[PDB]
Design a protein around this ligand. Structure first.
Ligand SMILES: [Zn+2]
Lengths: 146, 97, 53, 225
RNA sequence: GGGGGGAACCUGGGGAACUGAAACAUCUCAGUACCCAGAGGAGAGGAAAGAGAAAUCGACUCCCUGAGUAGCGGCGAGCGA
RNA sequence: UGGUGUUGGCUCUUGGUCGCGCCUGCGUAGGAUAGGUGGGAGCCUGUGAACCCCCGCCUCCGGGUGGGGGGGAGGCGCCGG
RNA sequence: GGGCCUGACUGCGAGGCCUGCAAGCCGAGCAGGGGCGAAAGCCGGGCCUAGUGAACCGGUGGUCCCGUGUGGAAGGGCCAU
RNA sequence: GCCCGGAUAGCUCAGUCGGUAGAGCAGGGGAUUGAAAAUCCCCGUGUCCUUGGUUCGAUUCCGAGUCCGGGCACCA
């Protein structure tokens, strides 16, 4: 199945490209996420002359990924929660940290864009990647306390 | 398992034909049938949940017609479906057929 | 008949057509029999090799 | 690990580039840097099994434009075939006592042909054979018109016979033949095998067709062009 | 606009067994009985991606014939264009 | 219960496929390890030598193998055998 | 018991016996081509009467008969089995 | 019926990715011996199952086949 990549993909390629992926991956993962489009002749036709626009909005992702990158690199977020001497009685997630930047710091990031492979259960400082734009990894210091 | 919501493939009535012996083509004396009994072949229906107009719509569609529904989804983009409920939305997408 | 006394044909050595069917005791005669039989196809007597029936 | 007369030839070759019968023939003589008239060789790969002892592409073709090479027919013939073999190109007659002229140690020829009446040539044979020179009518080298045979023997007539590694081997001429002269030289072996295809085979009858010269580099050439 | 009813008559979905095979399982009974849905005074079918041997015909439906023929068949019973 | 659809992504490893790049081939004889099938009387190194050392492979123990360094214009070849 | 030989034949078959049928049995003679024999002659298995099983289905070889528009082929038919 | 294993000396087996048929065996061709023992020996010997080919030669390598041992499958 052919699809028009709406983004640069590490295992697929880049926006504007039409690759062949099995129906499960794009059809359940990519299309609903808007990561790409089906390869219909209509979308092939409109494909031309939009890749300029598509890379335009993509470049917007680069720009706000930059002014937001430099803005959020130099700050540590603290998480006021209820935890033990060696254990967090609750848990933190991506949307949690987004809530912390929003209600506590006011900055607005995307929770899903944030990387969280394990909701934290221990205290202390943490450094994590965000990556708003492809090939744009952003570490970040979040502090969890009681 | 009922019809395919798009193709309308209903279950069919087929025969279980239990045979025996070697086929004539293989030098066998001939496939002696040991017994026939009715059965029903069912469509391989599946659930197809799709986000149209902020709504989730489920389609018990044949697997062979899975992508077809997505066509309708894209074909729905020339439509004004909000803020209709999933009943009217589904009836409209069927109207696209 | 027996597993020791088997059936057999007699191909003509020349027309190559099995013109006769007979039997032998393969115990006694472990050799392919060969006998001048009238080949109707060849239309004349001709040595016939014992062919596996 | 190679020669500056040869590495400089590998300098001017592209390993995976597709070449045609005309284009590569331009390349066969231009990279002919060996210090004599090289041999333009169309080394093709046949798509057949020699172990399948019916896919034996054993034949010949009198290539147009000759070959530029030397063919010396040690002719075997007697009874009015002596003198008609002595003429029309052959020079080694003869004509049946010359088998006794095979010591062996007398290898001043390049081919040996004998009429169908002999006969007394197959047995004596044992050393005339192991160098691939036993006169066999499968490829040219036997016939009552032994003089007629040698007439086209001298006319650059190559033999072809597939080997254990599914390969067939007959060069199209010397390094003195231009790409347009070799162009008939080249195709005269390809289409010579297009008709000698032993029917019954999986896949293409021609895996690949490469062209090297005497000491020269190989050449990835495209057949049927 | 629909609902529901309508003797039989029609499709469309489902669909038996007894019985015959002098047993019986393939098969036949029979796509019948019956059930369900739908209509309509009819229904269906209907304008060739047909027929099939003539370069032949020319949507469809039904009658006779083809023909118990071609055929199918534990090559049986039978069925049967 | 195995294939398959539904049903995807990453990677770890294994069995094929084809690329390629390489090495690999030994009665006697023949210097030596001769895989065939074609041309070959010529080749090579200042797009650095026979030589010496080092390194690994094969190694049939005769040897070859490929890579480095001194070396670096000295080796062979059909023909000899 | 010895000699040679394979008639333990091909195509057939007057006639008969037996018999519900079907089966079963005897066979002159004729032709092809042979065996033995001088020939006369005999030889179409065995001194005889048991040693066996209809049809269907299918296999194997010959056949070249049919081959679904045509040529092939699939597939069958027929012969042997 | 298909697929699996084997066929090599008078036997069992080895058996170059073809340059060699061999290990033992049975003996014996010999010599001792009136006979016969221990004995000497080279070993004797063999299509490496048959049919054709690869080959600069083919037990090998290849196609076909035969027989045998085995499994699987049908059985009118
Ligand atoms: Zn005959």
């Amino acid at each position: 199945m052919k699809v028009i990549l709406l983004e640069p993909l590490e295992n697929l390629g880049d926006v504007g490209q039409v690759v062949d992926v099995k129906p499960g991956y794009a059809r359940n993962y990519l299309l609903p996420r808007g990561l790409a489009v089906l390869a219909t002749e209509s979308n092939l036709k409109a494909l031309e002359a939009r890749i300029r626009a598509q890379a335009k909005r993509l470049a917007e992702r680069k720009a706000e990924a930059e002014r937001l990158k430099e803005i959020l690199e130099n700050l540590t977020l603290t998480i006021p929660v209820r935890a033990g001497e060696t254990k967090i009685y609750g848990s933190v997630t991506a949307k949690d940290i987004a809530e912390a930047l929003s209600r506590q710091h006011g900055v607005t990031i995307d929770p899903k864009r944030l990387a969280l492979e394990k909701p934290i259960k221990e205290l202390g400082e943490y450094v994590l990647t965000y990556k708003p734009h492809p090939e744009v990894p952003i570490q970040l210091k979040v502090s969890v306390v009681a | 398992s009922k019809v395919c919501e798009i193709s309308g493939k209903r279950p069919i009535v087929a025969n279980s034909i239990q045979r025996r012996g070697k086929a004539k083509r293989e030098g066998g004396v001939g496939k002696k049938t040991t017994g026939i009994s009715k059965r029903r072949q069912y469509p391989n229906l599946q659930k197809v949940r799709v986000r149209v107009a902020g709504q989730e719509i489920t389609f018990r569609v044949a697997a062979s017609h899975i992508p077809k529904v997505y066509e309708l989804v894209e074909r729905a983009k020339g439509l004004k479906l909000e803020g209709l409920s999933p009943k009217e939305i589904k009836k409209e997408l069927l109207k696209l057929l | 008949a027996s597993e020791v006394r088997i059936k057999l044909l007699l191909e003509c050595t020349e027309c190559k057509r099995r013109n006769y069917a007979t039997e032998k005791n393969k115990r006694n005669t472990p050799n392919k029999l060969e006998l001048r039989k009238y080949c109707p196809w060849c239309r004349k007597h001709t040595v016939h090799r014992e062919v596996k029936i | 690990k190679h020669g500056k007369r040869y590495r400089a030839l590998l300098e001017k070759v592209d390993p995976n580039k597709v070449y045609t019968i005309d284009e590569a023939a331009r390349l066969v003589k231009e990279l002919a840097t060996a210090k004599f008239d090289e041999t333009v060789e169309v080394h093709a790969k046949l798509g057949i099994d020699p172990r399948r002892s019916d896919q034996n592409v054993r034949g010949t073709v009198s290539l147009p434009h000759g070959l530029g090479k030397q063919v010396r027919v040690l002719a075997i013939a007697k009874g009015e075939k002596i003198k008609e073999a002595e003429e029309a190109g052959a020079d080694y007659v003869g004509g049946e006592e010359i088998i006794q002229k095979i010591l062996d140690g007398w290898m001043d020829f390049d081919a040996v042909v004998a009429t169908p009446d002999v006969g007394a040539v197959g047995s004596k044979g044992r050393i005339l054979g192991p160098r691939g020179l036993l006169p066999n009518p499968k490829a040219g080298t036997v016939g009552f018109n032994i003089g007629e045979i040698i007439r086209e023997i001298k006319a650059g007539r190559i033999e072809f016979r597939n080997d254990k590694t599914g390969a067939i081997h007959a060069p199209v001429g010397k390094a003195s033949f231009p790409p347009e002269k070799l162009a008939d030289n080249i195709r005269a072996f390809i289409r010579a095998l297009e008709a000698h295809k032993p029917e019954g085979a999986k896949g293409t009858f021609l895996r690949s067709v490469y062209v090297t010269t005497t000491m020269g580099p190989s050449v990835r050439i495209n057949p049927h062009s």
